[PDB]
Amino acid sequence: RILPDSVDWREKGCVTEVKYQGSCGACWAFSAVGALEAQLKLKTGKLVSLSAQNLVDCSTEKYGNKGCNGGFMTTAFQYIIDNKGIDSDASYPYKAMDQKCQYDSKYRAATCSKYTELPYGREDVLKEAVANKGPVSVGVDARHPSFFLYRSGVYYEPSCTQNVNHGVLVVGYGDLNGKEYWLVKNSWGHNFGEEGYIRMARNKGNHCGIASFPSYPEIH
Amino acid sequence: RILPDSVDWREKGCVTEVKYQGSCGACWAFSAVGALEAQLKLKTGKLVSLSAQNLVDCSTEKYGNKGCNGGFMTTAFQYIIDNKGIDSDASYPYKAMDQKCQYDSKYRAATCSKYTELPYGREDVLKEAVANKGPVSVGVDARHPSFFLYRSGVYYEPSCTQNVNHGVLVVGYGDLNGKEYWLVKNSWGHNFGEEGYIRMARNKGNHCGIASFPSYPEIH
Numbered sequence: 001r002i003l004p005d006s007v008d009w010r011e012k013g014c015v016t017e018v019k020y021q022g023s024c025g026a027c028w029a030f031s032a033v034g035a036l037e038a039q040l041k042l043k044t045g046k047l048v049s050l051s052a053q054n055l056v057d058c059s060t061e062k063y064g065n066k067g068c069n070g071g072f073m074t075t076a077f078q079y080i081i082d083n084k085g086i087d088s089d090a091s092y093p094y095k096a097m098d099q100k101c102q103y104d105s106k107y108r109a110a111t112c113s114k115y116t117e118l119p120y121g122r123e124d125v126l127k128e129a130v131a132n133k134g135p136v137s138v139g140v141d142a143r144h145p146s147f148f149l150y151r152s153g154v155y156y157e158p159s160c161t162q163n164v165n166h167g168v169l170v171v172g173y174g175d176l177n178g179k180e181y182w183l184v185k186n187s188w189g190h191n192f193g194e195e196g197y198i199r200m201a202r203n204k205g206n207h208c209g210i211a212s213f214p215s216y217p218e219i220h
Numbered sequence: 221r222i223l224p225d226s227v228d229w230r231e232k233g234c235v236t237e238v239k240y241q242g243s244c245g246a247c248w249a250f251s252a253v254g255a256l257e258a259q260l261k262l263k264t265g266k267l268v269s270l271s272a273q274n275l276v277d278c279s280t281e282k283y284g285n286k287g288c289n290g291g292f293m294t295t296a297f298q299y300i301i302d303n304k305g306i307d308s309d310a311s312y313p314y315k316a317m318d319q320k321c322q323y324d325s326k327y328r329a330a331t332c333s334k335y336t337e338l339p340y341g342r343e344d345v346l347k348e349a350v351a352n353k354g355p356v357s358v359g360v361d362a363r364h365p366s367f368f369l370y371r372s373g374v375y376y377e378p379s380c381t382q383n384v385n386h387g388v389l390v391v392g393y394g395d396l397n398g399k400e401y402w403l404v405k406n407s408w409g410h411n412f413g414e415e416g417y418i419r420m421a422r423n424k425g426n427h428c429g430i431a432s433f434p435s436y437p438e439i440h
Protein backbone atom coordinates (compact mmCIF):
# COMPACT_ATOMS: atom_id res chain seq x y z
CA ARG A 1 0.00 0.00 0.00
CA ILE A 2 0.89 3.76 -0.21
CA LEU A 3 1.70 4.44 3.43
CA PRO A 4 -0.24 7.05 5.38
CA ASP A 5 1.51 10.42 5.75
CA SER A 6 0.97 10.18 9.55
CA VAL A 7 0.19 7.50 12.15
CA ASP A 8 -0.71 7.75 15.85
CA TRP A 9 -1.54 4.43 17.50
CA ARG A 10 -3.09 6.29 20.44
CA GLU A 11 -6.01 7.06 18.04
CA LYS A 12 -6.80 3.29 17.74
CA GLY A 13 -6.62 2.71 21.48
CA CYS A 14 -3.43 0.63 21.20
CA VAL A 15 -1.21 2.60 23.66
CA THR A 16 -1.41 2.41 27.46
CA GLU A 17 -0.76 5.33 29.76
CA VAL A 18 2.82 6.47 30.19
CA LYS A 19 4.75 4.69 32.94
CA TYR A 20 7.41 5.96 35.37
CA GLN A 21 10.46 3.68 35.69
CA GLY A 22 12.04 5.64 38.56
CA SER A 23 15.74 5.05 39.18
CA CYS A 24 15.55 1.50 37.81
CA GLY A 25 17.02 1.14 34.24
CA ALA A 26 14.07 -0.89 33.02
CA CYS A 27 13.39 1.15 29.86
CA TRP A 28 13.96 -2.00 27.77
CA ALA A 29 11.17 -3.73 29.67
CA PHE A 30 8.79 -0.81 29.29
CA SER A 31 9.58 -0.59 25.55
CA ALA A 32 8.96 -4.32 25.09
CA VAL A 33 5.68 -4.44 27.01
CA GLY A 34 4.44 -1.34 25.17
CA ALA A 35 5.01 -3.00 21.79
CA LEU A 36 3.23 -6.16 22.96
CA GLU A 37 0.31 -4.20 24.50
CA ALA A 38 -0.54 -2.87 21.03
CA GLN A 39 -0.50 -6.36 19.50
CA LEU A 40 -2.70 -7.61 22.36
CA LYS A 41 -5.25 -4.79 21.67
CA LEU A 42 -5.20 -5.63 17.92
CA LYS A 43 -5.76 -9.34 18.64
CA THR A 44 -8.33 -9.25 21.49
CA GLY A 45 -9.83 -5.70 21.28
CA LYS A 46 -8.79 -5.01 24.88
CA LEU A 47 -6.09 -2.63 26.14
CA VAL A 48 -4.19 -4.06 29.11
CA SER A 49 -0.90 -2.78 30.63
CA LEU A 50 1.57 -5.68 30.75
CA SER A 51 4.09 -6.32 33.52
CA ALA A 52 7.46 -4.61 32.99
CA GLN A 53 8.37 -5.99 36.44
CA ASN A 54 7.81 -9.59 35.16
CA LEU A 55 10.51 -8.87 32.53
CA VAL A 56 12.86 -7.24 35.05
CA ASP A 57 12.64 -10.18 37.45
CA CYS A 58 12.40 -13.11 35.01
CA SER A 59 14.02 -12.19 31.64
CA THR A 60 17.44 -12.09 33.34
CA GLU A 61 20.91 -13.63 32.79
CA LYS A 62 19.78 -16.28 30.30
CA TYR A 63 18.45 -13.45 28.11
CA GLY A 64 21.49 -11.16 28.45
CA ASN A 65 19.44 -8.74 30.60
CA LYS A 66 20.41 -7.13 33.89
CA GLY A 67 17.11 -5.89 35.31
CA CYS A 68 17.50 -2.36 36.65
CA ASN A 69 20.96 -2.36 34.98
CA GLY A 70 19.62 -2.58 31.41
CA GLY A 71 18.67 -5.08 28.75
CA PHE A 72 17.26 -5.84 25.31
CA MET A 73 13.70 -5.58 23.95
CA THR A 74 14.37 -8.51 21.58
CA THR A 75 15.52 -10.89 24.29
CA ALA A 76 12.55 -9.76 26.42
CA PHE A 77 10.27 -10.86 23.58
CA GLN A 78 12.07 -14.20 23.39
CA TYR A 79 11.54 -14.68 27.17
CA ILE A 80 7.80 -14.15 26.69
CA ILE A 81 7.79 -16.72 23.84
CA ASP A 82 9.85 -19.27 25.85
CA ASN A 83 7.81 -18.65 29.02
CA LYS A 84 4.46 -19.01 27.15
CA GLY A 85 3.24 -15.78 28.72
CA ILE A 86 3.57 -12.48 30.53
CA ASP A 87 1.49 -11.30 33.50
CA SER A 88 -0.63 -8.15 33.58
CA ASP A 89 0.82 -5.04 35.22
CA ALA A 90 -2.13 -5.12 37.67
CA SER A 91 -1.17 -8.65 38.81
CA TYR A 92 2.60 -8.09 38.86
CA PRO A 93 3.16 -4.46 39.67
CA TYR A 94 6.24 -2.38 39.05
CA LYS A 95 8.54 -1.73 42.00
CA ALA A 96 11.60 -0.20 40.36
CA MET A 97 13.82 -2.94 41.90
CA ASP A 98 15.33 -6.29 40.98
CA GLN A 99 13.18 -9.01 42.59
CA LYS A 100 12.79 -12.80 42.46
CA CYS A 101 10.82 -14.09 39.48
CA GLN A 102 7.15 -14.30 40.54
CA TYR A 103 5.56 -15.19 37.17
CA ASP A 104 2.30 -17.14 37.50
CA SER A 105 0.24 -18.34 34.52
CA LYS A 106 -2.98 -17.64 36.43
CA TYR A 107 -2.18 -13.92 35.86
CA ARG A 108 -1.18 -14.28 32.21
CA ALA A 109 -2.48 -11.43 30.07
CA ALA A 110 -0.55 -11.96 26.82
CA THR A 111 1.58 -14.35 24.82
CA CYS A 112 4.11 -13.81 22.03
CA SER A 113 4.74 -16.06 19.03
CA LYS A 114 7.75 -14.32 17.47
CA TYR A 115 9.53 -11.03 17.01
CA THR A 116 11.10 -9.20 14.08
CA GLU A 117 14.24 -7.07 14.07
CA LEU A 118 14.24 -4.40 11.34
CA PRO A 119 17.27 -3.73 9.16
CA TYR A 120 19.77 -1.30 10.68
CA GLY A 121 19.18 2.39 10.19
CA ARG A 122 16.37 2.21 7.63
CA GLU A 123 13.82 4.90 8.43
CA ASP A 124 11.60 3.91 5.46
CA VAL A 125 11.34 0.31 6.74
CA LEU A 126 10.59 1.64 10.25
CA LYS A 127 7.82 3.84 8.76
CA GLU A 128 6.31 0.81 7.00
CA ALA A 129 6.37 -1.26 10.22
CA VAL A 130 4.78 1.53 12.31
CA ALA A 131 2.04 1.94 9.69
CA ASN A 132 1.36 -1.76 8.94
CA LYS A 133 2.33 -3.71 12.09
CA GLY A 134 2.10 -1.44 15.15
CA PRO A 135 4.29 0.41 17.61
CA VAL A 136 7.96 -0.54 17.34
CA SER A 137 10.50 -0.87 20.13
CA VAL A 138 13.67 1.17 19.45
CA GLY A 139 16.76 2.50 21.14
CA VAL A 140 17.81 6.15 21.08
CA ASP A 141 20.79 8.20 22.19
CA ALA A 142 19.20 9.95 25.22
CA ARG A 143 22.53 11.05 26.75
CA HIS A 144 22.51 14.72 25.74
CA PRO A 145 21.34 17.38 28.20
CA SER A 146 18.81 18.66 25.68
CA PHE A 147 16.89 15.37 25.79
CA PHE A 148 16.02 15.74 29.47
CA LEU A 149 14.90 19.35 28.87
CA TYR A 150 12.67 18.68 25.83
CA ARG A 151 9.22 20.26 26.15
CA SER A 152 7.63 20.64 22.68
CA GLY A 153 8.21 20.68 18.97
CA VAL A 154 10.44 18.26 17.08
CA TYR A 155 13.65 17.29 18.87
CA TYR A 156 16.82 17.74 16.78
CA GLU A 157 20.15 17.69 18.63
CA PRO A 158 23.27 18.22 16.48
CA SER A 159 25.36 16.42 19.15
CA CYS A 160 23.24 13.24 18.87
CA THR A 161 24.88 10.01 17.81
CA GLN A 162 23.89 6.50 16.75
CA ASN A 163 25.28 5.06 20.01
CA VAL A 164 21.93 4.33 21.59
CA ASN A 165 21.44 3.92 25.33
CA HIS A 166 17.67 4.24 26.00
CA GLY A 167 14.81 1.93 25.04
CA VAL A 168 11.59 3.66 23.99
CA LEU A 169 8.52 2.97 21.84
CA VAL A 170 7.69 4.51 18.45
CA VAL A 171 3.87 4.85 18.41
CA GLY A 172 3.56 7.01 15.32
CA TYR A 173 5.06 9.48 12.90
CA GLY A 174 4.06 12.63 11.07
CA ASP A 175 5.02 16.20 10.30
CA LEU A 176 4.69 19.23 12.54
CA ASN A 177 5.36 22.73 11.07
CA GLY A 178 7.45 21.31 8.21
CA LYS A 179 9.50 18.97 10.38
CA GLU A 180 9.03 15.22 10.03
CA TYR A 181 9.00 13.30 13.31
CA TRP A 182 8.73 9.98 15.07
CA LEU A 183 6.25 9.97 18.00
CA VAL A 184 8.09 8.36 20.91
CA LYS A 185 6.58 7.09 24.16
CA ASN A 186 9.10 7.32 27.03
CA SER A 187 8.97 5.71 30.50
CA TRP A 188 10.04 8.69 32.62
CA GLY A 189 6.50 9.59 33.64
CA HIS A 190 4.23 12.41 32.45
CA ASN A 191 6.65 15.12 33.59
CA PHE A 192 8.96 14.26 30.75
CA GLY A 193 8.38 15.98 27.46
CA GLU A 194 4.82 16.30 26.21
CA GLU A 195 2.94 14.19 28.76
CA GLY A 196 5.67 11.55 28.53
CA TYR A 197 6.16 11.73 24.76
CA ILE A 198 8.88 13.24 22.59
CA ARG A 199 8.64 13.97 18.86
CA MET A 200 12.07 13.09 17.46
CA ALA A 201 13.43 14.16 14.05
CA ARG A 202 12.58 11.76 11.21
CA ASN A 203 14.44 11.33 7.89
CA LYS A 204 17.38 13.34 9.39
CA GLY A 205 20.12 10.71 9.00
CA ASN A 206 18.91 8.18 11.58
CA HIS A 207 18.87 10.99 14.21
CA CYS A 208 19.85 9.75 17.66
CA GLY A 209 19.94 6.23 16.29
CA ILE A 210 16.15 5.90 16.38
CA ALA A 211 16.09 3.45 13.44
CA SER A 212 19.27 1.59 14.50
CA PHE A 213 17.70 -1.33 16.38
CA PRO A 214 13.92 -1.50 15.86
CA SER A 215 11.88 -4.63 16.75
CA TYR A 216 8.25 -5.63 17.16
CA PRO A 217 6.50 -8.73 18.51
CA GLU A 218 3.47 -10.59 17.22
CA ILE A 219 0.85 -12.83 18.80
CA HIS A 220 -0.46 -16.02 17.10
CA ARG B 221 14.86 -31.67 5.46
CA ILE B 222 16.34 -33.80 8.24
CA LEU B 223 19.59 -32.04 8.97
CA PRO B 224 22.97 -33.73 8.61
CA ASP B 225 24.49 -34.92 11.86
CA SER B 226 27.74 -32.98 11.11
CA VAL B 227 28.68 -30.17 8.70
CA ASP B 228 32.04 -28.57 7.91
CA TRP B 229 31.97 -25.66 5.45
CA ARG B 230 35.76 -25.95 5.08
CA GLU B 231 35.11 -29.18 3.15
CA LYS B 232 32.86 -27.16 0.79
CA GLY B 233 35.61 -24.65 0.00
CA CYS B 234 33.72 -21.76 1.64
CA VAL B 235 36.18 -20.76 4.41
CA THR B 236 39.30 -18.62 3.96
CA GLU B 237 42.56 -18.82 5.82
CA VAL B 238 42.46 -17.89 9.51
CA LYS B 239 43.26 -14.21 10.16
CA TYR B 240 45.11 -12.56 13.04
CA GLN B 241 43.42 -9.41 14.44
CA GLY B 242 46.32 -8.56 16.75
CA SER B 243 45.68 -5.88 19.33
CA CYS B 244 42.76 -4.33 17.39
CA GLY B 245 39.28 -5.41 18.59
CA ALA B 246 38.10 -6.14 15.04
CA CYS B 247 36.60 -9.57 15.73
CA TRP B 248 33.18 -8.29 14.58
CA ALA B 249 34.67 -7.25 11.25
CA PHE B 250 36.38 -10.64 10.77
CA SER B 251 33.19 -12.47 11.70
CA ALA B 252 31.16 -10.45 9.19
CA VAL B 253 33.63 -10.83 6.32
CA GLY B 254 33.92 -14.56 6.99
CA ALA B 255 30.15 -15.00 6.76
CA LEU B 256 30.06 -13.01 3.50
CA GLU B 257 33.10 -14.90 2.06
CA ALA B 258 31.09 -18.10 2.14
CA GLN B 259 28.10 -16.55 0.36
CA LEU B 260 30.44 -15.08 -2.26
CA LYS B 261 31.89 -18.57 -2.92
CA LEU B 262 28.39 -20.04 -3.20
CA LYS B 263 27.37 -17.30 -5.68
CA THR B 264 30.49 -16.94 -7.82
CA GLY B 265 32.64 -20.04 -7.31
CA LYS B 266 35.52 -17.83 -6.03
CA LEU B 267 36.96 -18.07 -2.49
CA VAL B 268 38.27 -14.57 -1.72
CA SER B 269 39.32 -12.96 1.59
CA LEU B 270 37.26 -9.77 2.04
CA SER B 271 38.53 -6.60 3.70
CA ALA B 272 38.02 -6.54 7.45
CA GLN B 273 39.95 -3.23 7.42
CA ASN B 274 37.26 -1.72 5.11
CA LEU B 275 34.73 -2.45 7.85
CA VAL B 276 36.97 -1.12 10.66
CA ASP B 277 37.60 2.15 8.80
CA CYS B 278 34.24 2.69 7.09
CA SER B 279 31.46 0.96 9.09
CA THR B 280 32.02 3.43 11.96
CA GLU B 281 29.94 5.89 14.05
CA LYS B 282 26.80 5.78 11.90
CA TYR B 283 26.75 1.98 12.23
CA GLY B 284 27.25 2.01 16.02
CA ASN B 285 30.73 0.58 15.54
CA LYS B 286 34.00 1.66 17.19
CA GLY B 287 36.69 0.12 14.93
CA CYS B 288 39.35 -1.46 17.09
CA ASN B 289 37.09 -0.89 20.13
CA GLY B 290 34.36 -3.26 18.90
CA GLY B 291 31.16 -3.38 16.89
CA PHE B 292 28.35 -5.38 15.37
CA MET B 293 28.32 -7.97 12.58
CA THR B 294 24.78 -6.98 11.66
CA THR B 295 25.57 -3.31 11.28
CA ALA B 296 28.69 -4.24 9.29
CA PHE B 297 26.42 -6.18 6.87
CA GLN B 298 24.18 -3.10 6.60
CA TYR B 299 27.19 -0.93 5.78
CA ILE B 300 28.08 -3.31 2.92
CA ILE B 301 24.45 -3.09 1.63
CA ASP B 302 24.35 0.72 1.96
CA ASN B 303 27.80 1.14 0.44
CA LYS B 304 26.98 -1.19 -2.51
CA GLY B 305 30.21 -3.11 -1.87
CA ILE B 306 33.17 -4.24 0.14
CA ASP B 307 36.76 -4.33 -1.16
CA SER B 308 39.01 -7.39 -1.34
CA ASP B 309 41.45 -7.95 1.49
CA ALA B 310 44.20 -7.94 -1.20
CA SER B 311 43.22 -4.35 -2.26
CA TYR B 312 42.51 -3.10 1.31
CA PRO B 313 44.71 -5.11 3.64
CA TYR B 314 44.46 -5.37 7.41
CA LYS B 315 46.49 -2.91 9.53
CA ALA B 316 45.18 -3.65 13.08
CA MET B 317 44.46 0.02 13.64
CA ASP B 318 41.68 2.58 13.04
CA GLN B 319 42.13 4.44 9.74
CA LYS B 320 40.32 6.96 7.53
CA CYS B 321 37.90 5.25 5.13
CA GLN B 322 39.76 4.23 1.96
CA TYR B 323 36.97 2.27 0.23
CA ASP B 324 37.18 2.39 -3.56
CA SER B 325 34.57 0.71 -5.76
CA LYS B 326 37.29 -0.19 -8.29
CA TYR B 327 38.43 -2.86 -5.80
CA ARG B 328 34.92 -4.15 -4.96
CA ALA B 329 34.99 -7.94 -4.32
CA ALA B 330 31.48 -8.53 -2.96
CA THR B 331 28.06 -7.05 -2.37
CA CYS B 332 25.36 -7.88 0.18
CA SER B 333 21.61 -7.74 -0.39
CA LYS B 334 20.27 -8.49 3.10
CA TYR B 335 21.08 -10.10 6.40
CA THR B 336 19.04 -12.23 8.80
CA GLU B 337 19.07 -12.28 12.57
CA LEU B 338 18.26 -15.57 14.20
CA PRO B 339 15.88 -15.77 17.12
CA TYR B 340 17.55 -15.42 20.47
CA GLY B 341 19.07 -18.48 22.07
CA ARG B 342 17.77 -21.17 19.67
CA GLU B 343 20.48 -23.72 18.98
CA ASP B 344 18.13 -25.77 16.73
CA VAL B 345 17.55 -22.73 14.52
CA LEU B 346 21.32 -22.09 14.46
CA LYS B 347 21.92 -25.70 13.39
CA GLU B 348 19.40 -25.31 10.53
CA ALA B 349 21.05 -22.07 9.34
CA VAL B 350 24.56 -23.57 9.45
CA ALA B 351 23.34 -26.66 7.53
CA ASN B 352 21.17 -24.91 4.96
CA LYS B 353 22.45 -21.33 4.56
CA GLY B 354 26.15 -21.14 5.39
CA PRO B 355 28.52 -20.06 8.13
CA VAL B 356 26.80 -17.88 10.74
CA SER B 357 28.27 -14.89 12.57
CA VAL B 358 27.82 -15.21 16.37
CA GLY B 359 28.94 -13.61 19.58
CA VAL B 360 30.34 -15.68 22.46
CA ASP B 361 31.34 -15.03 26.06
CA ALA B 362 35.15 -15.11 25.81
CA ARG B 363 35.62 -13.42 29.20
CA HIS B 364 37.21 -16.51 30.82
CA PRO B 365 40.88 -17.55 30.92
CA SER B 366 39.89 -21.02 29.67
CA PHE B 367 38.93 -19.43 26.29
CA PHE B 368 42.44 -17.92 25.90
CA LEU B 369 44.03 -21.17 27.06
CA TYR B 370 41.94 -23.50 24.84
CA ARG B 371 44.02 -25.99 22.82
CA SER B 372 41.84 -28.89 21.67
CA GLY B 373 38.63 -30.82 22.05
CA VAL B 374 35.16 -29.56 22.98
CA TYR B 375 35.28 -26.36 25.01
CA TYR B 376 32.99 -26.21 28.07
CA GLU B 377 33.41 -23.46 30.68
CA PRO B 378 31.18 -23.84 33.76
CA SER B 379 31.40 -20.08 34.49
CA CYS B 380 30.29 -19.13 30.93
CA THR B 381 27.35 -16.79 30.57
CA GLN B 382 25.11 -15.36 27.80
CA ASN B 383 26.86 -11.90 28.16
CA VAL B 384 28.71 -12.20 24.86
CA ASN B 385 31.67 -10.04 23.93
CA HIS B 386 33.63 -11.77 21.12
CA GLY B 387 32.49 -12.12 17.51
CA VAL B 388 33.34 -15.36 15.74
CA LEU B 389 32.07 -17.50 12.85
CA VAL B 390 30.26 -20.85 13.10
CA VAL B 391 31.52 -22.84 10.13
CA GLY B 392 30.10 -26.26 11.12
CA TYR B 393 28.91 -28.56 13.83
CA GLY B 394 29.41 -32.16 14.86
CA ASP B 395 30.28 -34.38 17.75
CA LEU B 396 33.51 -35.72 19.32
CA ASN B 397 32.49 -39.28 20.34
CA GLY B 398 29.02 -37.96 21.13
CA LYS B 399 30.18 -34.64 22.71
CA GLU B 400 28.24 -32.18 20.50
CA TYR B 401 30.00 -29.04 19.34
CA TRP B 402 29.89 -25.96 17.16
CA LEU B 403 32.95 -25.56 14.90
CA VAL B 404 34.04 -21.94 15.33
CA LYS B 405 36.55 -19.95 13.28
CA ASN B 406 38.30 -17.32 15.40
CA SER B 407 40.44 -14.34 14.27
CA TRP B 408 43.28 -14.80 16.80
CA GLY B 409 45.59 -16.34 14.22
CA HIS B 410 46.61 -19.89 13.43
CA ASN B 411 48.30 -20.49 16.82
CA PHE B 412 45.01 -20.14 18.74
CA GLY B 413 43.22 -23.39 19.59
CA GLU B 414 42.93 -26.01 16.85
CA GLU B 415 44.98 -24.06 14.30
CA GLY B 416 42.68 -21.05 14.60
CA TYR B 417 39.43 -22.91 15.43
CA ILE B 418 37.62 -23.78 18.63
CA ARG B 419 34.97 -26.47 19.02
CA MET B 420 32.43 -25.12 21.53
CA ALA B 421 29.79 -27.10 23.42
CA ARG B 422 26.51 -27.49 21.52
CA ASN B 423 23.06 -28.25 22.96
CA LYS B 424 24.36 -27.38 26.44
CA GLY B 425 21.97 -24.57 27.30
CA ASN B 426 23.20 -21.94 24.86
CA HIS B 427 26.73 -22.36 26.22
CA CYS B 428 28.68 -19.09 26.26
CA GLY B 429 25.81 -17.43 24.44
CA ILE B 430 26.80 -18.91 21.08
CA ALA B 431 23.16 -18.90 19.88
CA SER B 432 22.27 -15.57 21.53
CA PHE B 433 22.92 -13.24 18.56
CA PRO B 434 23.46 -15.16 15.28
CA SER B 435 23.25 -13.54 11.85
CA TYR B 436 24.12 -14.29 8.26
CA PRO B 437 24.25 -12.23 5.07
CA GLU B 438 23.08 -13.04 1.57
CA ILE B 439 23.99 -11.88 -1.92
CA HIS B 440 21.53 -11.06 -4.76
Ligand SMILES: *C(=N)CNC(=O)[C@H](CS(=O)(=O)N1CCN(c2ccccn2)CC1)NC(=O)Cc1cc(C)no1
Binds near residue numbers: 026027070138165167
Ligand atom coordinates in the same frame (compact mmCIF):
# COMPACT_ATOMS: atom_id res chain seq x y z
C1 LIG C 1 17.04 2.10 30.16
N1 LIG C 1 16.77 2.67 31.25
C2 LIG C 1 18.50 1.67 29.99
N2 LIG C 1 18.81 1.27 28.63
C3 LIG C 1 18.88 -0.01 28.30
O1 LIG C 1 18.62 -0.95 29.06
C4 LIG C 1 19.35 -0.23 26.87
C5 LIG C 1 18.17 -0.24 25.87
S1 LIG C 1 18.50 0.10 24.21
O2 LIG C 1 17.20 0.18 23.57
O3 LIG C 1 19.31 1.25 24.20
N3 LIG C 1 19.36 -1.09 23.57
C6 LIG C 1 18.71 -2.40 23.22
C7 LIG C 1 18.97 -2.59 21.70
N4 LIG C 1 20.44 -2.65 21.64
C8 LIG C 1 21.06 -3.32 20.57
C9 LIG C 1 22.38 -2.96 20.25
C10 LIG C 1 23.06 -3.62 19.26
C11 LIG C 1 22.40 -4.67 18.63
C12 LIG C 1 21.08 -5.00 18.97
N5 LIG C 1 20.41 -4.33 19.96
C13 LIG C 1 21.04 -1.35 21.95
C14 LIG C 1 20.80 -1.02 23.43
N6 LIG C 1 20.11 -1.46 26.78
C15 LIG C 1 21.46 -1.50 26.84
O4 LIG C 1 22.11 -0.48 26.86
C16 LIG C 1 22.07 -2.89 26.92
C17 LIG C 1 22.84 -3.09 25.67
C18 LIG C 1 23.70 -2.15 25.13
C19 LIG C 1 24.17 -2.67 23.91
C20 LIG C 1 25.17 -1.86 23.11
N7 LIG C 1 23.64 -3.90 23.67
O5 LIG C 1 22.78 -4.10 24.74
Ligand SMILES: *C(=N)CNC(=O)[C@H](CS(=O)(=O)N1CCN(c2ccccn2)CC1)NC(=O)Cc1cc(C)no1
Binds near residue numbers: 292359
Ligand atom coordinates in the same frame (compact mmCIF):
# COMPACT_ATOMS: atom_id res chain seq x y z
C1 LIG D 1 36.26 -8.39 19.26
N1 LIG D 1 37.54 -8.50 19.28
C2 LIG D 1 35.64 -7.42 20.30
N2 LIG D 1 34.18 -7.53 20.53
C3 LIG D 1 33.21 -6.96 19.78
O1 LIG D 1 33.41 -6.23 18.81
C4 LIG D 1 31.82 -7.41 20.21
C5 LIG D 1 31.35 -8.57 19.36
S1 LIG D 1 30.03 -9.50 19.93
O2 LIG D 1 30.02 -10.74 19.23
O3 LIG D 1 30.21 -9.66 21.30
N3 LIG D 1 28.66 -8.72 19.71
C6 LIG D 1 28.28 -8.48 18.35
C7 LIG D 1 26.88 -9.09 18.37
N4 LIG D 1 26.05 -8.18 19.22
C8 LIG D 1 24.67 -8.20 18.96
C9 LIG D 1 23.72 -8.03 19.96
C10 LIG D 1 22.36 -8.04 19.50
C11 LIG D 1 22.10 -8.22 18.14
C12 LIG D 1 23.11 -8.36 17.21
N5 LIG D 1 24.36 -8.34 17.66
C13 LIG D 1 26.43 -8.33 20.63
C14 LIG D 1 27.91 -7.99 20.73
N6 LIG D 1 30.90 -6.30 20.14
C15 LIG D 1 30.62 -5.58 21.22
O4 LIG D 1 31.02 -5.95 22.32
C16 LIG D 1 29.76 -4.37 20.92
C17 LIG D 1 28.45 -4.52 21.60
C18 LIG D 1 27.17 -4.35 21.09
C19 LIG D 1 26.30 -4.73 22.14
C20 LIG D 1 24.75 -4.60 22.18
N7 LIG D 1 27.04 -5.10 23.16
O5 LIG D 1 28.30 -5.06 22.81
